[PDB]
Design a protein around this ligand. Structure first.
Ligand SMILES: *[C@@H]1O[C@H](CO[C@@H]2O[C@@H](C)[C@@H](O)[C@@H](O)[C@@H]2O)[C@@H](O[C@@H]2O[C@H](CO)[C@@H](O[C@@H]3O[C@H](CO)[C@@H](O)[C@H](O[C@H]4O[C@H](CO)[C@@H](O)[C@H](O)[C@@H]4O)[C@@H]3O)[C@H](O)[C@H]2NC(C)=O)[C@H](O)[C@H]1NC(C)=O
Ligand code: X92
Ligand code: NAG
Ligand code: CL
Ligand code: CL
Ligand code: ZN
Length: 575
């Protein structure tokens, strides 16, 4: 009995390595070269992996995991019993694969055109408009045009996708796809736990929101900003208003303090995408963590091809399940925002390398939020003024300190409500609370409730603004990012303590700390082998998610914001 189970998991492991490697290859070849041909081969590797999954999954279900002694084998088998989409009947599976492809392709190739003028892609053209334009109408053109072309085009697919992903979930024992996604945390209290964390971050977010609102009122005019209302969603420097640091220049706390736009210095000093990834590689090895293999530099796609290929630009990190081949696919622009993204992606690679010797079933983060957090933790240290000066991107006070904390808050704090709301919407869609008649309206009620944003153009029939955000057509869960943004501060706090930092958490730089590296490595090596609180304990010395570290980091800014907002009589929040 125990021996039949051990044999099954050995067979699953050897066979999955091969099939998954093949699938990954075909997926890569489509994502880096969208053609009718690579599309065909991919829809076919889809059948190969589904047949494997069905064969092994059917077998795994014949085991009574109740009767199994060995906890590693019990866990693998329990996981393999979940077939995901391979539980679907053939016709439904083919239909589902095709909608997924059609949605991701639609998003990745959408353009927004001036009439008898040029057509702009999201990366880089529209991204650059939203980051740099300070003209209401130009921002509006890009914000609305993107939703009209990408969002509206996804709407035709999305009800059918919901039906099929929910069907698959039920066939694997869940009540709907959102139940199956939440299950990845193995935490029955997840919903409650996440709300509590979100509530802890409200003082900070509301004070940041009010401060930024006031600054936007100063630039865009009184007739366009209601000081007691939501902020128009196209003014925050980002297509989704999910991060706000591109409007730092409008909101600087101490504009008299000498400053140097990082992005401008990178370009002035001839940085390239390769240099950006090498810098990240260097931070990892400085910690005693693993270097990316030679193969990574040969095979990765670190900038947008200029050779006529059409690609999925949206940055991602890829494991080919052979313990040797790891790659990033990103349409990298030379700027600080993408340096942070590069670190993020390099964290995923780091995780893949750390757990490469586990059985493939356990080759995941402790929970999905841990996978997202690793690269972000190193990027916190990278972003410090001291570290950017060491890279020759900054030439150099309480003034500079508050300025820095505001720059950081515009990314990290502004993202909290956005990252919370995405799957609050999708969970309700999947559980049937939001129908296709109310997709958009319910999105905007959440955008208002959590972020305090309004749409600058009233939405109409046929809009499907969630479709204009990559993870929606791509079927990538989002709550991981909310988790990540909380826990990355816990990890920074712990690692700073392990490295012997004293003084304010925000002045920590863990560059070259082997003590910090070792903490991270022990945790990453666990993969998915143990309940996530064990990885949390290895890093932090305690088992809980907690907002305390993020609050600690930002406390000097909280104080500064409260004093500033009070001085101007701001009314926090909106109706
Ligand atoms: C429950 O089952 C798990 C899984 O077992 C593994 O998979 C099964 C399907 C089957 O094929 C098993 O035969 C197979 O082991 C057991 O967990 C594994 O436990 C062993 C320990 O017996 C671990 O082995 C380690 O492997 C390292 C890398 O190859 C190796 O370097 C380690 O040794 C190090 O320590 C020695 C001490 O002598 C020292 O010389 C060095 O410091 C050296 O490097 C060590 O042998 C596996 O890694 C575990 N595998 C996984 C995937 O977790 C588990 O023990 C079992 N539970 C019970 C109660 O028996
Ligand atoms: C750029 C990044 N791309 C995602 C791709 C995820 C993915 C997953 C599965 C298949 C295809 C793509 C990731 O690396 O987690 C991303 O979407 N985000 C999120 C986002 O931009 O929405 C916020 C996260 C912090 C830094 C960058 C991270
Ligand atoms: C893109 O795919 C086409 C069709 O499969 C193939 O012939 C071509 O060589 C590919 N281009 C690159 C750069 O790989
Ligand atoms: Cl939107
Ligand atoms: Cl997730
Ligand atoms: Zn990620």
């Amino acid at each position: 009995d125990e021996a039949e189970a051990s044999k099954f998991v050995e067979e699953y492991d050897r066979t999955s390595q091969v099939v998954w490697n093949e699938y990954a290859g075909a997926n890569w070849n489509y994502n880096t070269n969208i053609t009718t041909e690579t599309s065909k081969i991919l829809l076919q590797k889809n059948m190969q992996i589904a047949q494997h999954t069905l064969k092994y999954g059917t077998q795994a279900r014949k085991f009574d995991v109740n009767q199994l002694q060995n906890t590693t084998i019990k866990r693998i088998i329990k996981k393999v019993q979940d077939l995901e989409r391979a539980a679907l009947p053939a016709q439904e599976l083919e239909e589902y694969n095709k909608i997924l492809l059609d949605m991701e392709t639609t998003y990745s190739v959408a353009t927004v055109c001036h009439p008898q003028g040029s057509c702009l892609q999201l990366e880089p053209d529209l991204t650059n408009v939203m980051a740099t334009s300070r003209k209401y109408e130009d921002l509006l053109w890009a914000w609305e045009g993107w939703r009209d072309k990408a969002g509206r085009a996804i709407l035709q697919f999305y009800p059918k996708y919901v039906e099929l992903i929910n069907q698959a979930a039920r066939l694997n024992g869940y009540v709907d796809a959102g139940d199956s996604w939440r299950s990845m945390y193995e935490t029955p209290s997840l919903e409650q736990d996440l709300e509590r964390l979100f509530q802890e971050l409200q003082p900070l977010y509301l004070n940041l929101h009010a401060y930024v609102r006031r600054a936007l009122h100063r630039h865009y005019g009184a007739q366009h900003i209601n000081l007691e209302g939501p902020i128009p969603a196209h003014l925050l420097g980002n297509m989704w208003a999910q991060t706000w640091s591109n409007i730092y220049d409008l909101v600087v706390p101490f504009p008299s303090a000498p400053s140097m736009d990082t992005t401008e210095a990178m370009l002035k000093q001839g940085w390239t995408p390769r240099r950006m990834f090498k810098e990240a590689d260097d931070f990892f090895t400085s910690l005693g963590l693993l270097p990316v293999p030679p193969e990574f530099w040969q095979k990765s796609m670190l900038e947008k091809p200029t050779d006529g290929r059409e690609v999925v630009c949206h940055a991602s990190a890829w494991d080919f399940y052979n313990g040797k081949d790891f790659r990033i696919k990103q349409c990298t622009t030379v700027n600080l925002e993408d340096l942070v993204v590069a670190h993020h992606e390099m964290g995923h690679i780091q995780y893949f390398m750390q757990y490469k010797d586990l059985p493939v079933a356990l080759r995941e983060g402790a929970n999905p939020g841990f996978h997202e957090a690793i690269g972000d933790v190193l990027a916190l240290s990278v972003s410090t003024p001291k570290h950017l000066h060491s890279l020759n991107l900054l030439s150099s006070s309480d003034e500079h300190d508050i300025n820095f904390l505001m720059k950081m808050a515009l990314d990290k704090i502004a993202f909290i409500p956005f990252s919370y709301l995405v799957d609050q919407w999708r969970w309700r869609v999947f559980d049937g609370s939001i129908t296709k008649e109310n997709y958009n309206q319910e999105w905007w009620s959440l955008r208002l409730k959590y972020q305090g944003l309004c749409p600058p153009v009233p939405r109409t029939q046929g809009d499907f603004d969630p479709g204009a955000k990559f993870h929606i057509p791509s079927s990538v869960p989002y709550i991981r990012y909310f988790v990540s943004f909380i826990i990355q501060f816990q990890f920074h706090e712990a690692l700073c303590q392990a490295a012997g930092h004293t003084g304010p958490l925000h002045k920590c730089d863990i560059y070259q700390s082997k003590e910090a590296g070792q903490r991270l490595a022990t945790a990453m090596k666990l993969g998915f082998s143990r309940p996530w609180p064990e990885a949390m304990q290895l890093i932090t010395g305690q088992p809980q998610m907690s907002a305390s570290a993020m609050l600690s980091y930002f406390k000097p800014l909280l104080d500064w914001l409260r004093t500033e907002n009070e001085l101007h009589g701001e009314k926090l929040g909106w109706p």
